[PDB]
């Protein structure tokens, strides 16, 4: 059945410039991060639901299909996990700062032996960001190591033929490594009208205060089922199904 | 609980599901963003400048028995775009029930 979170405050957008929200397939955004970053300190939808006590466990989980045809395209479950979408047991690690769903990255290693973030860095787990992002210069390095060429502004491309032979990249999160094979981190698109492959890593620096940060976006979540546990303030990963 | 919410996948770039705002509910598709903390949808009072609401759904306050005005102005900047409007209050149904 649905829930009805009542007396939720939301904004009504009257001006939104740029190509971005014109092109975007979606009408708006429901943010599910911490109230600490809420504009006008509005109480967020999950916090209001939580307060109203409408779910037994204050957790929510994402499954995202990586096949464009495959229905359902993904599944969010409000108040529990779904076992047909992941396999194994979930691996948890705690939130390091409560604003975004921020977590500690131990290091990122391209198999060839390019180790980025050796010494550890910070990452936010974000369902609203399509690709993986990381600091410009570090990502450039990563990109050249797997032979992707620049398009514009930190977006990279690989001739689709090569996908099948690139190195796997491992993100070590909380002890164990999470592995992204080439077909996981490349997106087959159609610019002009043709089969092109986007590199699934784009470089963009987030300024301090909050930055510099890696952003584990849908590319990651597309391979590893993610649970956001507001009750324990920990993120949980498992290989998807 | 638990409430499954089916998302649509668009190019492995955009994942979005449907929610309803209002009594009776008006149905909006939204990304459930773990990277921000606000809910907003276009208003029917959007400026002709907002090319985005020429083609997205627009929330019409007058058709909701549960609408409480608020009027405070917000402004949000995403890595991908900014926007602004005024805040309002109503019932959110996940899904459009």
């Amino acid at each position: 059945g649905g829930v009805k979170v009542e007396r939720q405050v939301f904004g009504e957008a009257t001006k939104q410039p740029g190509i971005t929200f014109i092109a975007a397939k979606f009408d708006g955004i429901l943010g599910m991060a911490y109230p600490r970053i809420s504009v006008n300190n509005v109480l967020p939808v999950f916090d209001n639901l939580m307060q109203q006590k409408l779910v037994d466990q204050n957790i929510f989980s994402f499954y995202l299909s990586r096949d464009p045809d495959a229905q359902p395209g993904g599944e969010l479950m409000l108040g529990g996990t779904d076992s047909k979408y992941y396999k194994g047991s979930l691996s948890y690690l705690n939130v390091t700062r409560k604003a975004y769903w921020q977590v500690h990255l131990d290091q990122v290693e391209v198999a060839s032996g390019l180790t980025l973030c050796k010494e550890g860095c910070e990452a936010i787990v974000d369902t609203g960001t399509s690709l993986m992002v990381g600091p410009v210069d570090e990502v450039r390095e990563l990109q050249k190591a797997i032979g992707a060429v620049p398009l514009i502004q930190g977006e990279y491309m690989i001739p689709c033929e090569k996908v099948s032979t690139l190195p796997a990249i491992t993100l070590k999160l909380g002890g164990k490594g999470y592995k992204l094979s080439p077909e996981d981190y490349t997106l087959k698109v159609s610019q002009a009208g043709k089969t092109l492959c986007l590199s699934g890593f784009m470089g963009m620096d987030i300024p301090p205060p909050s930055g510099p940060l890696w952003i584990l976006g849908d590319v990651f979540i597309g391979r590893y089922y993610t649970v956001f546990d507001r009750d324990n303030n920990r993120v949980g990963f498992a290989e998807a199904a | 609980g638990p409430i499954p919410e089916v998302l649509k996948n668009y190019m492995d770039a955009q994942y979005y599901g449907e929610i309803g705002i209002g009594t009776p509910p008006q149905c909006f598709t939204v990304v459930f963003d773990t990277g921000s903390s606000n809910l907003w949808v276009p208003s029917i009072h959007c400026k002709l400048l907002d090319i985005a609401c020429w083609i997205h759904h627009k929330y019409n306050s007058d058709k909701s028995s549960t609408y409480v005005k608020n009027g405070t102005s917000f402004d949000i900047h995403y890595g991908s775009g900014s926007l602004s409007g005024y805040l309002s209050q109503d019932t959110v149904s996940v899904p459009c029930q």
């Binding site: 504009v39 | 963003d33 949000i76 995403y78």
Partner: peptide, 6 residues
């Protein structure tokens, strides 16, 4: 792409 609240 799209990177959502800086």
């Amino acid at each position: 792409x799209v990177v959502x609240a800086x």
